[PDB]
Design a protein around this motif. Structure first.
Motif, short mmCIF file in Angstrom:
data_model
loop_
_atom_site.label_atom_id
_atom_site.label_comp_id
_atom_site.label_asym_id
_atom_site.label_seq_id
_atom_site.Cartn_x
_atom_site.Cartn_y
_atom_site.Cartn_z
N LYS A 1 0.83 -1.20 0.00
CA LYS A 1 0.00 0.00 0.00
C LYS A 1 0.86 1.26 0.00
N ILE A 2 1.49 1.54 1.14
CA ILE A 2 2.34 2.72 1.26
C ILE A 2 3.62 2.49 0.46
N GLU A 3 3.95 3.45 -0.40
CA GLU A 3 5.14 3.37 -1.24
C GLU A 3 6.23 4.25 -0.65
N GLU A 4 7.40 3.67 -0.42
CA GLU A 4 8.54 4.37 0.14
C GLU A 4 9.77 4.14 -0.72
N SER A 7 16.97 7.60 -1.34
CA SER A 7 18.03 8.07 -2.22
C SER A 7 18.86 9.08 -1.44
CB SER A 7 17.46 8.69 -3.49
#
Ligand SMILES: Nc1ncnc2c1ncn2[C@@H]1O[C@H](COP(=O)(O)OP(=O)(O)O)[C@@H](O)[C@H]1O
Lengths: 447, 48
Positions: A1-4, A7
């Protein structure tokens, strides 16, 4: 669900030629108007398309081209464009005309060191090695006691094998403090020995320990491998000048002395030439001659402008690129003779002059925009026009310089782009090379 | 079509799902994670 995403590595810095990516020519050999970060200079970019083909033909040797023109006209920009076009495999040697003055070796010999560094070479070598964990080590004895054989048991994942080796290998093993259970890697071309530490099996033996543990090597105990290597003639020459290979005591202690340069004689160069010819005839050595770039050539002493006569008439000397931005100047080391670009006529007859002209106001705006989008700054149209007039007044280098601090002040007060007010305020803060000259001549009596 | 298939498969089939039977089961949390390719990876992707 949550995209992390993550960089954290920083980008590379921006140099003075980070936008030049090539000559930007066409298949017919003409020059475009704006391609690969270069604009204008059609008569010079077209003449540089002949030079890249000359390099890639691998036919001529001892040809010189001299880029001449006023400062800021793109000489070294064209040179870096040529270097970018020729690719990474072809060796490119940057050089400044003031580097020939050294306190260790004479001025003449540095030119040779650079010529020999300019020419490349590709070698397909084969190395046979014995790797693995040592399970048994025994020095044999004979009549005087002396050592004649070394018995070594190496156990890899496949199995274990016993080898008889020269006493030099035993000397190297004793040097590195190699005992049973320590993974080693010996190469038979040079006899070098490298220890990587004890095996991973002996991990729980000691509660406290300092040695690092490497896993058991996989494969055969003895194996040969093929390595492709890129080298230059000057690497072989310098390695044979003051040798450091071998497991003896002379080279080992020569590895520790101060690395002073030395004047290589003609005999070593000739013998290296013969050896590399023999390598070529075997179908392994491939020759890839490259380009040496000499910048600010106008300040070579007359002892370097004249050795180049014999240095360029050689059948080995690569293609040399000169660069000068001086008018009728006196030759350094002569104090009486004046010549165009400082270079004497006699050497000037052996070069092809690529004339470079000054830039027009229309190209100034395009160059400024290219540089601004290279840095990563956003500039409005009116601000860009104002920078154009500023560049026409003084120079394009000043306009390029002003691009960053203007963005700094723009981002101080929340703005996202450069406006005319920022450019004018920056122009007020910093001074030109000509305005400062005026304010200096006004108060000349009091400095 | 879908309604007819559901009617056909309704008698000789069951189903519960997770709400009917899970009386105390924390709803699992699914997390995506994009990862960028390295230098060597990029040289190879270019070759490819
Ligand atoms: N045709 C061109 N295209 C893009 N940038 C150029 C061009 N000509 C000159 N420049 C820029 O002008 C700056 C100064 O020119 P430079 O290459 O140093 O010439 P010179 O060596 O004669 O001073 C360089 O940073 C270069 O990026």
């Amino acid at each position: 669900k949550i995209e992390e995403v993550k960089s954290t590595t920083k980008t590379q810095r921006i140099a003075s030629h980070s936008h030049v990516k090539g000559l930007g020519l066409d298949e017919s050999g003409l020059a475009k108007q704006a391609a690969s970060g270069l604009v204008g200079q059609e008569n010079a970019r077209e003449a540089c398309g002949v030079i890249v083909e000359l390099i890639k033909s691998k036919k001529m040797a001892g040809r010189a081209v001299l880029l001449a023109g006023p400062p800021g006209t793109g000489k070294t920009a064209l040179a870096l464009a040529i270097a970018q076009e020729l690719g990474s495999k072809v060796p490119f040697c940057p050089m400044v005309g003031s580097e020939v003055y050294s306190t260790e070796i004479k001025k003449t010999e540095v030119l040779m060191e650079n010529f020999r560094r300019a020419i490349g070479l590709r070698i397909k070598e084969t190395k046979e090695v014995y790797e693995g964990e040592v399970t048994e080590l025994t020095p044999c004895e004979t009549e005087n006691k002396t050592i004649s054989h070394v018995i070594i048991g190496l156990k890899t994942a496949k199995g274990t094998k016993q080898l008889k080796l020269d006493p030099s290998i035993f000397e190297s093993l004793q040097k590195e403090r190699v005992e049973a259970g320590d993974v080693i890697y010996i190469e038979a071309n040079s006899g070098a020995v490298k220890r990587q530490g004890r095996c991973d099996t002996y991990a729980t033996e000691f509660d406290l320990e300092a040695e690092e543990y490497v896993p058991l090597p996989k494969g055969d105990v003895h194996k040969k491998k093929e390595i492709i290597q890129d080298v230059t003639l000057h690497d072989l020459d310098v390695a044979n000048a003051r040798p450091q290979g071998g497991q003896d005591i002379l080279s080992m202690m020569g590895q520790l002395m101060k690395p002073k340069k030395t004047e290589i004689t003609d005999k070593l160069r000739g013998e290296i030439n013969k050896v590399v010819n023999k390598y070529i005839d075997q179908g392994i050595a491939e020759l890839v001659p490259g380009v040496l770039f000499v910048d600010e050539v106008h300040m070579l002493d007359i002892e370097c402008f004249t050795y180049l006569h014999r240095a360029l008439e050689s059948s080995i000397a690569p293609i040399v690129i000169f660069a000068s931005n001086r008018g009728n100047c006196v030759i350094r080391g002569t104090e009486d003779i004046t010549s165009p670009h400082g270079i004497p006529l006699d050497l000037l007859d052996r070069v092809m002059i690529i004339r470079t002209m000054l830039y027009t106001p229309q190209e100034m705006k395009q160059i400024i925009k290219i540089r601004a989008q290279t840095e990563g700054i956003n500039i409005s149209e009116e601000a860009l026009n104002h920078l154009g007039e500023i560049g026409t007044k003084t120079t394009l280098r000043y306009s390029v310089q002003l691009l960053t601090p203007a963005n700094l002040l723009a981002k101080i007060n929340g703005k996202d782009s450069i406006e005319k007010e920022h450019v004018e305020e920056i122009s007020e803060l910093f001074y030109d090379a000509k305005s400062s000259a005026k304010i200096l001549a006004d108060q000349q009596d009091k400095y | 079509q879908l309604s007819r298939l559901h009617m056909i498969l309704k008698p000789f089939m069951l189903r519960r799902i997770k709400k009917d039977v899970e009386n105390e089961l924390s709803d699992k949390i699914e997390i995506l994670m994009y990862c960028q390719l390295t230098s060597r990876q990029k040289l190879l992707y270019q070759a490819l």
